[PDB]
Amino acid sequence: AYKLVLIRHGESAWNLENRFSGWYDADLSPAGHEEAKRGGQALRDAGYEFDICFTSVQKRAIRTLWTVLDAIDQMWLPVVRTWRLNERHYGGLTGLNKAETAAKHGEAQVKIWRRSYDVPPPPMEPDHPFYSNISKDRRYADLTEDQLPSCESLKDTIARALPFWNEEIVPQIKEGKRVLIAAHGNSLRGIVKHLEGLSEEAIMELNLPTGIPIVYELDKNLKPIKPMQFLGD
Amino acid sequence: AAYKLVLIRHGESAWNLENRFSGWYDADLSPAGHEEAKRGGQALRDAGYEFDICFTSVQKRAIRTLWTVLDAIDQMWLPVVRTWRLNERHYGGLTGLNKAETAAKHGEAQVKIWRRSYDVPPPPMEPDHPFYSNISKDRRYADLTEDQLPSCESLKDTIARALPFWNEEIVPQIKEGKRVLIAAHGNSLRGIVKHLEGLSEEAIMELNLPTGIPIVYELDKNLKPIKPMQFLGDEETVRKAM
Ligand SMILES: O=C(O)c1ccc(-c2ccc(Cl)cc2O)cc1NS(=O)(=O)c1ccc(-c2ccccc2)cc1
Ligand SMILES: [Cl-]
């Protein structure tokens, strides 16, 4: 009866979670920090122990993990970071609020992007103010040309998260290590879709809560034995 | 030089405020020790330092110092490796005692022996010690062999178990070109410095690394220092550390 815990980070600075924060390395707001604090509170109240932690290379998820480890007195745990758990790359939309997105591209196209599993936003181009900030960031210097996205469909995001799940996380779960994953809405979507065998439409309707420990109980073949559970009140 | 290595010793802990022996007890930083780490991280940020991998102990006063530095230099994304081999010296039965309790129980002559000696350990931490289960039964040491888990350590013991991690895990990374940052403790960092500089027992026992201060080594391809250690900081802070 393996136990797996996911946590999605909370609010980022400057309202960037409502501005397609994407691969821009926005920090948590103080409220998002408090969210992570309460999630860690909940994990420690329930007496949870972990053996290894996985997170992205984005500081809002890393800081969520740090806050949780602090609260549960497990800062000594091994931590593994990977770009494959990063948030979806929103291309040229990154940093724009909803009104600006609709102004620039029109409501028809925005609705198409919102409802599509496999259509990416426009690429982030050199005139985008985040272009060099993300694409030339040292943390991605080992990625090959086709690994570093200029934009991602949801299909793309899940396609680059799942090799990490299969290759690095699954072997740990199968050895009995109690895994904690602190990551982002869409990378965690990829994991949940793989675990529950959800359809494209279903995963696109799934909106995981933030700051809340999400608990899975898996059988020998890593199939959930019951619906995902939340920790708290 | 071919390579650059940076060390940082954590600052004041909650038990330092109580003048208690921590050793392997997992005391957190005091607010002032946290502020020390922030200033060291700021010094690394001002100097434009970049790292590729970080090593630390399994003790939160060192881990939190690393976290604080990584935050300051905006390199929170770096790989981090934790190891018990970088832990503070294990003070055995003295763990949890303060200065007065130690002097009262053991006397001046014995305490001077322990202070001055390279290879005489303090008394062992026995099963009835108040922190025995808290430390020796902590699941973070579950994979240590029976001989690896200390009941007490002389400085020679501490250095003897830190240096295998240096040789087997850190040296290969440096020679692979990785820019290493080590955030650890006075006595485990003493082990590294003694090896790097070929210092005597006498010399390493007289070395007190400053806390919260980035310590910079410029190393040739054989990991031999090309010059004495450098301290990073403003004129004032670097002068206090001489
Ligand atoms: O100064 C400290 O309190 C001290 C505290 C801890 C240690 C110490 C202990 C164990 C280890 Cl493994 C490492 C250490 O560094 C050394 C100290 N300094 S001392 O020069 O040796 C000294 C120790 C006792 C006394 C004394 C005793 C009884 C009645 C009156 C006076 C006077 C001087
Ligand atoms: Cl970490």
The secondary structure of chain B, three-state, reads CCEEEEEEECCCECCHHHCECCCCCCCCECHHHHHHHHHHHHHHHHCCCCCCEEEECCCHHHHHHHHHHHHHCCCCCCCEEECHHHCCCCCHHHCCCEHHHHHHHHHHHHHHHHHHCCCCCCCCCCCCCCCHHHHHCCHHHCCCCCCCCCCCCCHHHHHHHHHHHHHHHHHHHHHCCCCEEEEECHHHHHHHHHHHHCCCHHHHHCCCCCECCCEEEEECCCCCECCCCEECCCHHHHHHCC
Ligand 2 centroid from CA B63, angstroms: 8
Token pair recorded at residue A157 = 């995001």
The response to whether residue B102 sits with its C-beta less than 6 Å from ligand 1 reads yes
Q: Does A78 touch chain B (CB under 8 A)?
A: yes
- Cβ-based contacts under 8 A for chains A and B: 30
Q: Coil, helix or strand for A4?
A: strand
Classify burial at A232, counting beta carbons within 10 Å of its beta carbon; exposed 0-12, middle 13-18, buried 19 or more: middle
Q: How far apart are CA A182 and CA A56, in angstroms?
A: 8
CB nearest to A75's CB, from B63, B78, B139: B63
Q: Are A72 and A40 in contact (CB under 8 A)?
A: yes
Token pair recorded at residue B66 = 């690393």
Residue with the nearest Cα to atom 19 of ligand 1?
Answer: B112
Q: How far apart are CA A56 and CA A38, in angstroms?
A: 21
Q: Does B51 touch chain A (CB under 8 A)?
A: no
Range of the domain at A54: 1-233
Q: How far apart are CA B72 and CA B54, in angstroms?
A: 14
Q: How far apart are CA B95 and CA B130, in angstroms?
A: 9
Query: Is A9 considered catalytic here?
Result: yes
Beta-carbon count within 10 A of B63 CB: 27
Q: Are A23 and A94 in contact (CB under 8 A)?
A: yes
The response to whether residue B105 sits with its C-beta less than 6 Å from ligand 1 reads no
Pocket of ligand 1, candidates B95, B98, B105, B111: which has the most ligand atoms within 8 Å of its Cβ, to mutate? B111
Rounded to an integer, what is the distance from CA B74 to the centroid of its chain?
23
Query: Pick from A160, A228, A224, A210: which is nearest to A9 by CA?
Result: A210
Ligand 2 centroid from CA B86, angstroms: 15
Q: Are B241 and B213 in contact (CB under 8 A)?
A: yes
Binding-site members of A for substrate are: 8-15, 21-22, 60, 87-90, 98, 114-115, 185-186
Q: How far apart are CA A163 and CA A165, in angstroms?
A: 5
**Side chain identity, residue B19:** N
Q: How many domains does chain B have?
A: 1
Q: Is the dihedral of CA B136, B137, B140, B143 positive or negative?
A: positive
Chain B interface mutation, best of A56, A73, A75, highest count of B Cβ atoms under 10 Å: A75
Residues from chain A that touch B77, judged by Cβ atoms under 8 A, are: 57-59, 62, 81, 139
Q: How far apart are CA A38 and CA B152, in angstroms?
A: 38
| Burial profile B106-122: b = 16 or more Cβ within 10 angstroms, e = fewer | beeeebeebeeeeeebb
- Nearest C-alpha of chain A: how many angstroms from B117? 31
- What contacts B9, CB < 8 A, 6 or more positions away? B184, B185, B186, B189, B209, B210, B211, B212, B213, B215
Q: Coil, helix or strand for A79?
A: strand
Side-chain-side CA neighbours of A118 within 13 Å: the count stands at 2
Token pair recorded at residue B102 = 């130690």
Query: Is B88 considered catalytic here?
Result: yes
Residue A26 per-residue DSSP state = P
CB nearest to A59's CB, from B50, B76, B82: B76
Q: How far apart are CA B116 and CA B206, in angstroms?
A: 10
What is the DSSP annotation of A192-216?
HHHHHT--HHHHHH--PPSSS-EEE
Cα torsion B29, B31, B36, B39 to 10°: value is 130
CATH number, domain of A55, equals 3.40.50.1240
DSSP lists the bridge partners of residue A4 as A179, A216
Beta-carbon count within 10 A of B38 CB: 17
Q: How far apart are CA B8 and CA B61, in angstroms?
A: 12
- What contacts B94, CB < 8 A, 6 or more positions away? B21, B23, B102, B122, B123
Beta-carbon count within 10 A of A188 CB: 23
Which ligand has the minimum distance to the alpha carbon of residue B95? Answer: 1
Beta-carbon count within 10 A of A109 CB: 15
- Nearest C-alpha of chain A: how many angstroms from B224? 28
Q: Do B60 and A81 touch (CB under 8 A)?
A: no
Query: Pick from A102, A79, A136: which is nearest to A20 by CA?
Result: A102
Residue A91 per-residue DSSP state = G
Query: Pick from B130, B132, B124: which is nearest to B157 by CA?
Result: B124
Active-site choice (A17, A33, A35, A87):
A87
Q: Are A216 and A3 in contact (CB under 8 A)?
A: yes
- Nearest C-alpha of chain A: how many angstroms from B17? 21
The response to whether residue B112 sits with its C-beta less than 6 Å from ligand 1 reads yes
Q: How far apart are CA B226 and CA B229, in angstroms?
A: 9
Token pair recorded at residue B194 = 């003694």
Q: Do B139 and A78 touch (CB under 8 A)?
A: no
**What stretch of H or E contains A122?**
none
Q: Which long-range contacts (CB under 8 A, 24 or more apart) does A219-228 make?
A: A219/A1, A219/A2, A222/A2, A222/A170, A222/A173, A222/A174, A222/A195, A223/A195, A224/A195, A224/A196, A225/A1, A228/A192
| Burial profile A12-23: b = 16 or more Cβ within 10 angstroms, e = fewer | beeebbebbbbb
Q: How far apart are CA A168 and CA A109, in angstroms?
A: 37
Rounded to an integer, what is the distance from CA B224 to the centroid of its chain?
21
